[PDB]
Design a protein around this ligand. Structure first.
Ligand SMILES: CCCCCCCCCCCCC/C=C/[C@@H](O)[C@H](CO)NC(=O)CCCCCCCCCCCCCCCCC
Length: 227
């Protein structure tokens, strides 16, 4: 019932419709992780859509999404931010976050102001696993005005997670696989030199996906499974 409910449903639906389609240049492949990028410059602004897939043993989609969304563990895995805070809590599954990013010479420092929502998308019936999604997308908020010290990036990011699993036995983490699709469409919000930006992305996206997925595996190991 919060004021962004209509926008959230639009953003989530568009991801479920378009973000799972099969793709674009391979940036890196390492184990089960594949990172792809489409080269796109629009009016000189580098928009380069990013899409990655991964298959992570021993964690569920619900777990992966909880850890990606939960701001309390953010600093345990995220390495590209200087500072962040929660501007507003909209619902138990929806918050607005302001954050500033590490500065990359020679461009101005970027900041971002986004709604971050976590949603369970049921299967047709409970015979099949639900999909979990976290969507982070830019919004306006009067408590976080555009400022003169940072260039305001505009983002649409999603992490979409599918969970793949004898007699009376218990399910073990060794027999669960989480298939992750991560998409990032980032508008840097102003001019940035293309070569510099592209080198940063090439390095930082795979770094993040490795670090983040390893983190969840480490923190869930030996804990009861949250489906
Ligand atoms: C050490 C250098 C790093 C500096 C970072 C540059 C600024 C980035 C601009 C905003 C990107 C938005 C990131 C998305 C964040 C959230 O959804 C989420 C929680 O924070 N994290 C990720 O998805 C994890 C996403 C990890 C993203 C890293 C890739 C960076 C994208 C490149 C865009 C370049 C921005 C222009 C800066 C100047 C370039 C010359």
């Amino acid at each position: 019932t919060h004021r962004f409910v209509q926008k959230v449903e639009e953003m989530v639906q568009n991801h479920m419709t378009y973000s799972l389609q099969d793709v674009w240049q391979l940036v890196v492949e390492e184990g089960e992780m594949k990172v792809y990028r489409r080269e796109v410059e629009e009016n000189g602004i580098v928009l380069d859509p990013l899409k990655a897939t991964h298959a992570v043993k021993g964690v569920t989609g619900h777990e992966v999404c909880n850890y990606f969304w939960n701001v309390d563990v953010r600093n345990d895995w995220e390495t590209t931010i200087e500072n962040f805070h929660v501007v507003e809590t909209l619902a138990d599954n929806a918050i607005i976050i302001y954050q500033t990013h590490k500065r990359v010479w020679p461009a101005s420092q970027r900041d971002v102001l986004y709604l971050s929502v976590i949603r369970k998308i049921p299967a047709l019936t409970e015979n099949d696993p639900e999909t979990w999604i976290v969507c982070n997308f830019s919004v306006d908020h009067d408590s976080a005005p555009l400022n003169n010290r940072c260039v305001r990036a505009k983002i649409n990011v999603a992490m979409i997670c599918q969970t793949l699993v004898e007699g009376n036995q218990e399910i073990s983490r060794d027999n669960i696989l989480c298939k992750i699709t991560y998409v990032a469409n980032v508008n840097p919000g102003g001019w940035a030199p293309a070569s510099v930006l592209r080198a940063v992305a090439k390095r930082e996206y795979p770094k993040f996906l490795k670090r983040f997925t390893s983190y969840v595996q480490e923190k869930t190991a030996g804990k009861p499974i949250l489906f």
